[PDB]
């Protein structure tokens, strides 16, 4: 039964090194990650379809993010994401 818990936990330590998280709380973050993942995936999925494309690329994820998230949260989400794709592409 896969879950995002360990990565959730890592992120927690970079943010609040000395803070912990109960089970139920870990379980909520898990629901949260899956939910957002499904919402973004879905919208990217439609985006492609409307445009008769067969590939969901980083472009689709981006527009999906713009459509799904609130202004400021979107602004960051977009940069964070652009940053990850760049650093990734610039690396052997």
């Amino acid at each position: 039964k896969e879950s995002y818990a360990i990565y959730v936990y890592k992120v927690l330590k970079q943010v609040h090194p000395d803070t912990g998280i109960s089970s139920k709380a870990m379980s909520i973050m898990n629901s949260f990650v899956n939910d957002v993942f499904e919402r973004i995936a879905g919208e990217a999925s439609r985006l492609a379809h409307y445009n008769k494309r067969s590939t969901i690329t980083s472009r689709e994820i981006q527009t999906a993010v713009r459509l799904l998230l609130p202004g400021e949260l979107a602004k960051h989400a977009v940069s964070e994401g652009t940053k990850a794709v760049t650093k990734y592409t610039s690396a052997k």
Binding site: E2, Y4, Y7, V8, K10, V11, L12, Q14, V15, H16, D18, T19, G20, I21, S22, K24, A25, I28, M29, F32, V33, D35, V36, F37, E38, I40, A41, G42, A44, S45, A48, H49, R53, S54, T55, I56, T57, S58, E60, I61, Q62, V65, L68, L69, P70, G71, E72, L73, H76, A77, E80, G81, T82, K83, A84, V85, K87, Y88, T89, A91
Partner: protein
Amino acid sequence: AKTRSSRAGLQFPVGRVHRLLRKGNYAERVGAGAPVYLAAVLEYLTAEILELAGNAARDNKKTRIIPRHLQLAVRNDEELNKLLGRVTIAQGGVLPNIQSVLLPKK
């Protein structure tokens, strides 16, 4: 070998996200950066909620984040609140709020 998450410089599992995109029937094909970008966005949001949920715990003199701490973190933030406007966080309760007109006439 070096994991994609490491190259992308992320904590979240790029490999898994990629996998999950394919098996999800969201499209015939899936570019290489999509799971990277996607994973990056999920880490960032995760960081946002934990960051706040965290402050919520310190503010209540507690070290372990609990649901209450996630509820108080989300509904006290305009954007996260909108993003989760149709989501119920179990064991979250509500924010303390009493309509003025209900307060005793001082």
